Amino acid sequence: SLNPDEPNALLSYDFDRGSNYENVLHLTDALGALVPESETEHPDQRFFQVTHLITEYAWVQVHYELRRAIGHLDEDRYHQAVRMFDRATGLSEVTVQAVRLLTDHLPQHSLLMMRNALPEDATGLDSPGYRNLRRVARPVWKAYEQAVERAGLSLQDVIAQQDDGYDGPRSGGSQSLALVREAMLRLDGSVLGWKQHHLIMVWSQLGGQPGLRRSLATLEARSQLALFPELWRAAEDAYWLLGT
Amino acid sequence: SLNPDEPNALLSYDFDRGSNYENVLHLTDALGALVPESETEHPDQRFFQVTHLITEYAWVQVHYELRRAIGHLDEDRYHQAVRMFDRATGLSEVTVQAVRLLTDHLPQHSLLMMRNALPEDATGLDSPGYRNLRRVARPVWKAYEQAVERAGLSLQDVIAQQDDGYDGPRSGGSQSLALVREAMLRLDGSVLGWKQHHLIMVWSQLGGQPGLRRSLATLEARSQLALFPELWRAAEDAYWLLGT
Amino acid sequence: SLNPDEPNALLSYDFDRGSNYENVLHLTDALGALVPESETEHPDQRFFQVTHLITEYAWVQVHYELRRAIGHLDEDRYHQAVRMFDRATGLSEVTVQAVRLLTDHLPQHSLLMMRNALPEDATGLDSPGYRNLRRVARPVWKAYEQAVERAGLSLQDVIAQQDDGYDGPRSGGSQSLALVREAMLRLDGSVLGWKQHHLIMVWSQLGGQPGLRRSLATLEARSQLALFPELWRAAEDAYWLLGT
Amino acid sequence: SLNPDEPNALLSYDFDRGSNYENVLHLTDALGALVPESETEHPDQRFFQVTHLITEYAWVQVHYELRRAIGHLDEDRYHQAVRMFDRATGLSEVTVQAVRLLTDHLPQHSLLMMRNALPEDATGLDSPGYRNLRRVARPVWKAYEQAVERAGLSLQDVIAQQDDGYDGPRSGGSQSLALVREAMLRLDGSVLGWKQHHLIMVWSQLGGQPGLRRSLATLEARSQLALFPELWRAAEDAYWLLGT
Ligand code: HEM
Ligand code: HEM
Ligand code: HEM
Ligand code: HEM
Ligand SMILES: C[C@@H](c1c[nH]c2ccccc12)[C@H](N)C(=O)O
Ligand SMILES: C[C@@H](c1c[nH]c2ccccc12)[C@H](N)C(=O)O
Ligand SMILES: C[C@@H](c1c[nH]c2ccccc12)[C@H](N)C(=O)O
Ligand SMILES: C[C@@H](c1c[nH]c2ccccc12)[C@H](N)C(=O)O
């Protein structure tokens, strides 16, 4: 492979040129995964494939950075945990962009023709990025919870410390764990956003949009499972404890 | 008003300077709507206010452009309708950014303190942008539907024509109405996205995140009402007619 | 209930009508600034105005948050200053989205016709939002620099501590000042981004693209001034110190 | 099931295991390109690699869609070409998000340490994605220009018809070529955007910010070359023709 074409003018996609850019990145191995253009069953199949691969790359990186967050949290390196969660959120937002590409540009008619030939078994439930992100979420939450325990703080404390008008006592440690909580909440909101945009996409490709009233019922229910349910519970606590 | 301050160094927000930039835009009238800083009950109130105003400005512009789309559709100016829907989508994406600003940076504790003093009657159900966008959606859909009728096309036709591999007959008119449908679908997906991001925001401020299992039940149901339900019905039709 | 348009098919109206949602937001004042439809030179005039207004609301709010950041830095409330800079950054990203709206949807031919009917002397150099943002950048930088001095820290020390591999000394205060630094650099990068997208927009409307070899030469040179030039200087010193 | 990491607490593993979802996507091949954890110089190396890989997947897909656009333009399938350019634009926006990820989260100090352990001759000038995109821009522009000729149209005619106020002649083919033009200009603006954000990123890592008065001078001059310089020339001619 020096190219994924054979006929052309300047239309040839030249790659595998031995540059150290390609060597450092292992770009030829990555480009090797694309369905060769001699085996595409549809002009839109590549687009379908590439958006999945971009997502899976972002999700494996999210996993990696969450493992680092656990290390930082277990060693009280709270400022360094913050950066890991912020980076994970940025990567999650790429997966959102990627599924919205399908919503905006994948023709339902192409998808139905393609799907009418799939192994009728290819389900995103088997996605490694998704399964592993779900697994690592429990250790991640445990590490944050124990850090809050060791500091002698309650979740209501770190939540309240985000408000400049809140007058209770603070330390450098409690405000750092506040920043961590806020960054974890933003990551979780971004993953929930992915689930909601993936839903909108599915309604536009397989039907089932609920305003009118293919295992859509389980999908709609799974689409509201948070990464960190304890953060959302704490939000609900604050409403009941502080509201009027 | 030459300023929204009184004490300062270079910290003064100088405005109302008579420039023709300000005159053309009526910027002094717009800046006049901000709660004066002598009457703010909380440092986060301005942020709350400004994100609403940005949204309402985008929604009134969406309304304006949809009225233009109706004109173009009623006169068979399909290429010009496309641009109106594309512009409306871009504006809708601003409202999404704006509600995600609250999710990411509005402290729940500030909101609860602020809300603990609101007229306990200020509901987004009274939003002019939202109500008027809901009203105009029916005329908008009617105008598109009649245009498809006059051309002698079915919705399944315009949907199928988005796929390059589809072999049925096309005209310039049918592919133009295909582009219009696609742009309308993207607008509707963006408004559904707003409703979903507004939901995530509310779960993070008032609780009620459904994975754990304040009129949240009606909100969750209204959050799946589409602007153009007939487009989503047609997506469901295509699944049943073309799938295996 | 008022009305931004008069002779219509009734379902194509917009309304302004005294609810508490509108009262709390001063919404009727804000919508009052829109150019009346009885007075529009061109159908694209509303769009032109609204993207400016959205931008100006974002910039006035940026200023308000930078003032709060100055207050936090002067009192050594470093964690609280971080949140202010991050909020400013997200507001800045709304201005980027607003100017790209014009790049993507404002027809050059409507801009040229509108520029003829428009006061020849109206210029964005008179933006209150842009002008006050440049004025407030000086005290913001001073407050950060003073806070770093009081802590007895080196700006190069602050930069190095963002790296997990860095082995030198860390306190809680130095790592907090590190997070402030990074948040400040993200804000400045966002504003540079605005300047760059505004340039791309001007090239597509008034011509002047530099690769082809009306106050353009100043605009390009102005487009490279940072809000916090010292942070970019500090980035240059670190390269000579560690990358040669 | 394989594993991108070995000695762990079991819930912190990543897996690769033969489902049809993985088979259809060639996912195991694609994840194989990630640098093994046993071989990473620095914890920020994975992040560095993944943002490049995501970018390169996006660019190879852009190329594939531009090839399709050439095919559509050569056969006068103008509506179909529009969809290809819009898809390319959204893919380009993923590359922008990917490089801003480095601007916002890659520590300069890790980049300098990593740049030392890295082959001194590796350069983005050898990007297959970037290189093929520049090569394919020439036939893309030719196909568009030829299509406009065959229609007997003026590029200024095509520009004017984007305006709803324009009164001159319009056919279905001229307005289709107008939509193609606008989609092409949005793509080029997106790529200019990438170049500008890449510059901002380089300034924050290698120094070199131009407002402070290592192949920087070429990079800045390269950052202003468009993919379709004729469209920007055409924008300049329209200003002299109509804005003086
Ligand atoms: C970037 C593209 C996509 C990615 C990364 C992706 C990923 C996923 C993931 C992770 C799940 C498990 C979701 C959960 O448990 O909440 C899932 C399920 C599902 N996906 Fe997607 N998906 C993509 C595109 C699509 C498309 C284009 C369709 C159909 C047109 C689709 C249809 C479904 C359905 C019906 C389910 C649930 C039932 C089932 O597993 O078959 N997905 N997908
Ligand atoms: C940019 C900011 C916001 C905008 C433009 C906005 C707008 C709206 C709109 C249009 C509705 C009607 C929704 C529907 O029928 O589906 C609504 C309802 C609602 N909003 Fe939001 N909202 C904003 C922020 C908030 C915040 C910060 C909260 C609470 C923390 C909130 C709580 C609610 C609730 C509970 C409802 C439904 C029940 C009710 O009307 O009280 N909103 N809002
Ligand atoms: C959409 C909202 C817009 C905003 C908020 C805005 C704001 C600004 C600002 C703040 C400046 C000063 C730049 C600096 O000093 O670095 C400026 C200058 C300039 N703007 Fe924009 N602008 C907008 C749209 C436009 C449009 C549509 C044009 C169309 C030609 C334009 C053309 C120019 C030019 C040529 C300058 C350079 C100085 C001058 O000739 O007045 N701007 N604008
Ligand atoms: C994140 C993904 C990145 C991609 C996809 C990428 C791609 C590229 C491309 C395509 C060029 C050629 C530009 C042109 O010819 O106009 C280039 C040049 C360059 N890149 Fe980036 N780049 C990335 C990250 C970085 C980073 C982190 C640095 C850090 C210093 C960097 C530094 C440079 C420099 C200095 C040049 C100019 C020529 C040279 O010295 O090699 N790039 N890069
Ligand atoms: C689950 C979904 C699918 C989602 N992502 C996929 C990737 C490769 C193959 C198939 C898929 C599949 N098209 C479905 O309709 O269920
Ligand atoms: C409906 C929501 C509200 C939403 N947007 C608002 C604007 C101004 C005043 C109040 C609101 C309100 N805070 C609530 O909790 O119901
Ligand atoms: C500076 C620019 C302008 C930019 N923003 C504006 C707002 C209102 C009136 C004019 C403007 C103006 N159109 C120009 O061509 O110089
Ligand atoms: C050109 C740039 C580089 C940019 N992208 C890369 C990918 C792999 C290795 C190196 C690079 C490189 N770091 C440099 O400083 O020149």
Automatic annotation (TrEMBL), chains A, B, C, D:
<feature type="binding site">
    <location>
        <position position="215"/>
    </location>
    <ligand>
        <name>heme b 2</name>
    </ligand>
</feature>
<keyword id="KW-0479">Metal-binding</keyword>
<feature type="binding site">
    <location>
        <position position="123"/>
    </location>
    <ligand>
        <name>heme b 1</name>
    </ligand>
</feature>
<feature type="binding site">
    <location>
        <position position="198"/>
    </location>
    <ligand>
        <name>heme b 3</name>
    </ligand>
</feature>
<feature type="binding site">
    <location>
        <position position="214"/>
    </location>
    <ligand>
        <name>heme b 3</name>
    </ligand>
</feature>
<feature type="binding site">
    <location>
        <position position="222"/>
    </location>
    <ligand>
        <name>heme b 3</name>
    </ligand>
</feature>
<feature type="binding site">
    <location>
        <position position="198"/>
    </location>
    <ligand>
        <name>heme b 2</name>
    </ligand>
</feature>
<feature type="binding site">
    <location>
        <position position="130"/>
    </location>
    <ligand>
        <name>heme b 3</name>
    </ligand>
</feature>
<keyword id="KW-0349">Heme</keyword>
<feature type="binding site">
    <location>
        <position position="123"/>
    </location>
    <ligand>
        <name>heme b 2</name>
    </ligand>
</feature>
<feature type="binding site">
    <location>
        <position position="222"/>
    </location>
    <ligand>
        <name>heme b 1</name>
    </ligand>
</feature>
<protein>
    <submittedName>
        <fullName>Tryptophan 2,3-dioxygenase</fullName>
    </submittedName>
</protein>
<keyword id="KW-0408">Iron</keyword>
<feature type="binding site">
    <location>
        <position position="198"/>
    </location>
    <ligand>
        <name>heme b 1</name>
    </ligand>
</feature>
